[PDB]
From a paper:
Baloxavir marboxil (BXM) and its active metabolite baloxavir acid (BXA) is a first-in-class inhibitor targeting the influenza virus polymerase PA N-terminal endonuclease domain (PAN) that was approved in Japan and the United States in 2018.6 The RNA-dependent RNA polymerase of the influenza virus cannot synthesize its own 5′-mRNA cap, which is necessary for eukaryotic translation. To overcome this, the polymerase engages in a unique “cap snatching” mechanism, in which the polymerase subunit PB2 captures host pre-mRNA and PAN cleaves 10–13 nucleotides to serve as a primer for viral mRNA synthesis by the PB1 subunit. PAN is a metalloenzyme that is essential for viral replication, is highly conserved, and is not naturally occurring in humans, making it an attractive antiviral target. Despite its clinical success, BXM has demonstrated susceptibility to resistance mutations, specifically the I38T, E23K, and A36 V mutants of PAN.
WT, I38T, and E23K PAN displayed an average melting temperature of between 58 and 61 °C, while A36 V proved to be much less thermally stable with a melting temperature of 50–52 °C. However, the ΔTM of the A36 V mutant with BXA is 21.7 °C, nearly identical to that of BXA with WT, suggesting the binding of BXA to the A36 V mutation is strong despite the instability of this mutant. Although it was hypothesized that the A36V mutant would disrupt BXA binding by disrupting α3, the DSF experiments revealed that the A36V treated with BXA did not show a significant change in ΔTM. This suggests that the A36V mutation causes very minimal or no change at all to the binding of BXA. The structure of A36V in complex with BXA indeed shows no notable changes in the binding mode of BXA to the protein when compared to WT. No large changes to α3 such as rotamer changes, or changes to the overall structure of the helix were observed. The change from alanine to valine does change the side chain from a methyl to an isopropyl which changes both the conformational entropy and hydrophobicity of α3.27 A36V is partially surface exposed so it is possible the mutation promotes local or global unfolding. If this is the case, the crystal structure of A36V would be very similar to the WT structure, and assays such as DSF which measure unfolding through reporter binding to hydrophobic residues would give lower values than the WT due to A36V promoting unfolding of the protein. Additional studies to determine the ΔG between the unfolded and folded states would be needed to unambiguously determine if the resistance mechanism for this mutation is linked to the instability of the protein. The E23K and A36 V structures are the first reported structural data for these mutants and may aid in studies to develop a structure–activity relationship (SAR) for these variants.
Author numbering: -1 to 52, 75 to 198
Write the structure that this text describes.
Amino acid sequence: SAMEDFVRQCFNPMIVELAEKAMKEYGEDPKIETNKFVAICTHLEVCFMYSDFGRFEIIEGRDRIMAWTVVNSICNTTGVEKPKFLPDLYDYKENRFIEIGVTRREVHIYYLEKANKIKSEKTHIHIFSFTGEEMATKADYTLDEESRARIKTRLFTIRQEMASRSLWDSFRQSERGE
Ligand SMILES: O=C1c2c(O)c(=O)ccn2N([C@@H]2c3ccccc3SCc3c2ccc(F)c3F)[C@@H]2COCCN12
Ligand SMILES: [Mn+2]
Ligand SMILES: [Mn+2]
């Protein structure tokens, strides 16, 4: 599959290895769900960039046990309420958990979907598209504009490499089902 080749060529081996472990956890095959594979790599990379953007602890890219160990440690030392689902980051400055979303759809739709899912006002949502759009809880985008710019540039680049390989249309229609 050209998509698996693109994923392994454009993404860091550490990212790819972590995405493959996540996919194994949920019983998904990166050789069949290749578009998801690349989606998981992309969002992992966004989360890592966001975190180095500070300030942030990363919850994503860890296995469930260690990830919940970190979340509980945070809730014990800061007293922030325990989230109902694994978030992606913890903000020590604003002392709040953060869910990152990356969409090939309109950011407002994905934001509404995420907010309906977590149903907890406490966790902050930050949605990124592949064309520079973003939607965040209370339009509190957390990061400075240079940092968000670097994230947005990397996402657009991925979209354009996919486009270069005639992979973008398939990728786009894979996010939502019928
Ligand atoms: O952590 C996440 C997750 C997010 O944090 C997210 O933002 C979007 C989507 N997620 N989901 C991720 C995921 C992460 C990034 C991009 C796409 C996917 S798509 C479903 C799936 C995920 C992981 C492995 C796998 F095999 C999957 F099928 C699942 C939902 O619940 C549990 C963990 N998780
Ligand atoms: Mn996550
Ligand atoms: Mn996320």
